[PDB]
From a paper:
In metazoa, the combination of Hsc70 (the constitutively expressed human cytosolic Hsp70), DNAJB1 (a class B JDP), and Apg2 (NEF Hsp110) can disassemble αSyn, tau and huntingtin exon 1 amyloid fibrils by depolymerisation and fragmentation. Here, we use cryo-electron microscopy (cryo-EM) to investigate the structure of DNAJB1 in complex with αSyn amyloid fibrils. This reveals that DNAJB1 binds in a tightly packed array all along the fibrils with a 40 Å repeat. DNAJB1 interacts with the flexible C-terminus of αSyn, in particular residues 123–12919.
To see if the linker and J domain play a role in this binding geometry, we examined the complex formed by αSyn amyloid fibrils with a truncated DNAJB1, lacking the G/F linker and J domain (ΔJ-DNAJB1). As for WT DNAJB1, we performed single-particle analysis using the amyloid fibril reconstruction toolbox in RELION 3.1 to study ΔJ-DNAJB1 in complex with αSyn amyloid fibrils. We then generated a structure at 3.2 Å with a helical twist of -1.33° and a helical rise of 4.74 Å. This structure is different from the two forms shown in Supplementary Fig. 2, but similar to a reported structure with an additional density at the N-terminus displaying a hairpin-like shape (PDB: 6OSJ26). However, we could not assign the sequence for the additional hairpin because of a gap in the density. The ΔJ-DNAJB1 map shows that the removal of the J-domain and G/F linker does not change the regular, asymmetric binding of DNAJB1 to the fibrils. Despite this limitation, the maps clearly revealed DNAJB1 binding in an unanticipated, asymmetric position with one subunit of the homodimer closer to the fibril surface, packed with a ~ 40 Å repeat all along the fibrils. This pattern of binding was observed for both WT and ΔJ-DNAJB1 in independent experiments with different fibril conformers.
Numbering used by the authors:
A (entry chain C), B (entry chain B), C (entry chain A), D (entry chain D), E (entry chain E): 14 to 25, 36 to 97
F (entry chain J), G (entry chain I), H (entry chain G), I (entry chain F), J (entry chain H): 14 to 25, 36 to 96
């Protein structure tokens, strides 16, 4: 049917951030709806959602997402 | 059949963040609805949703997500 | 048949975060609804949801999520 | 048949967080609803939900989640 | 029916967190509903939900969750 | 200094209130502060602070309030 | 000299309200502050602060308020 | 000399409201500040602060308010 | 100084309101500030701040307000 | 100084409102500011600030407001 496979087989500076905020409003991945049917949110990676957000060397391997929404098939 | 599979088999700087905020409002992954039917949220990775959020070497292997929603199939 | 499977078989630097907030409001993975049928939230990874959130070497292995919602099938 | 499986068979710096918060309000994985039928929350990983939340080397093995909700089949 | 299985067979820095809060309100994995039928919450990992939360080397093995809810099957 | 005087000398329908609440939260005359030096509240009248509040013919006479605060002299 | 004086000397229908609420939050006369010095609240009249608040023939006489705040000199 | 005086000397229909609320949030006379010095709220009349608020024949007399704030000199 | 005065002497119809709301947020006389010195709010009349607010024959006499703020001199 | 005065002496139709709201946000008299000195709000009349607001025969008498803000001298 719906298959997702991922494999990770292996034969194994300065980043300054200076901030100053006042009255910050932040939204990340958002899904606002009204009279819908499904609301699927699959996160395989990273979602950094700061007022001050820093990400370093974040996602290094084998992501796999398989989604199937609906399919009435009457 | 909804199948997910993940395998991780292995034969084995400075980051200053200076923050100063005042009245921050932060939302991460949000899902707002009225009169829906399913609300599926699968996180295979990382969701960092601070006012000051830092992620370092975060996700590094074998993420597998399989989602199948709805399917009336009458 | 909804199947997940994960295998992790293995044959085996300064992080300063200086913060100062005042009246911070933070929401992580949120799901708000009315008149729904299912609300599935599967976390195979990490959800860091601070005012000051730091994640380091967070997710390093064999994440498998298999979600199958709805399925009236008649 | 909803099956999960996981195996982890192994044949085997500085982290400074300085915080100062006044009146912080924090929510983690939240599921708010009215007139739902199921509310399933499976955590195979970590949910760190502080005002000052730090996670190091958090999830490193064989996470398996298999969820199957609804299924009227009538 | 609903089978889970997990096996873990093995044949073998500095953390400074300085916090200062005043009137911090913290929630974690929460599930709020009215007129619902099932409310299932399975934790196979860790939920750290302090005002100050630190989790080091948290989840290192063989997590397996298998959930099957609803199933009217008339 | 601070004088208040009040004299009252007297010589000689249908109310339907149908309410149906659920989880009501009510605050009346409120005063919230930090590091304040004085916090004075004088009520010469009526303070009706219900979830369902009905007031009829409440205050009919000689209210006198004399408030004098501070005076760091 | 802060003086308040009031005198009241007398030498002498259908009201239907129908309410149905759910999750009501109500604040009346509110005073929120930080690092203030005085917070004076004098009420000479009526403060009706319901979720369903009804006031009829409420205040009918001789209200006097005299407030004098601060005066560092 | 902050003076307030008031005198009231006297020598001798259908109202239907039908409401339906869900998740109502109401604030009346509100005063919000940070790092202020004085916060004076004198109410001589009526403050009706419902989700459903009805006021009939509310204030009919001799209201007198005298306010004097500050005056550093 | 600051003087007020008011005298009220006297020698003596269908109103249908049909309402239906959902998620109503209402504010009345509001005062929001940062680093102020005075915040004076005097009400000599009526402040009806409902979600469904009705006022009938509300204010009918002798309102007097005197206000004097500041005066650093 | 700052004086006020007011006197009210006297010697002795269907109105239908039908409303439907969903997600209504209403503000009345508002004063938003930062780093100011004074914030004065005197109400001598009526302030009706509903989602559905009706005011009938509201203010019929002798309003008087005197305000004097500042005057550094």
């Amino acid at each position: 049917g719906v298959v997702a496979a991922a494999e990770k087989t292996k034969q194994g500076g300065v980043l300054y951030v200076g901030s100053k905020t006042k009255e910050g409003v932040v939204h990340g991945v958002a899904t606002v709806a009204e009279k819908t049917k499904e609301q699927v949110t699959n996160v395989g990676g990273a979602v950094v959602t700061g007022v001050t957000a820093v990400a370093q060397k974040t996602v290094e391997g084998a992501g796999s997402i398989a989604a199937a929404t609906g399919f009435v098939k009457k």
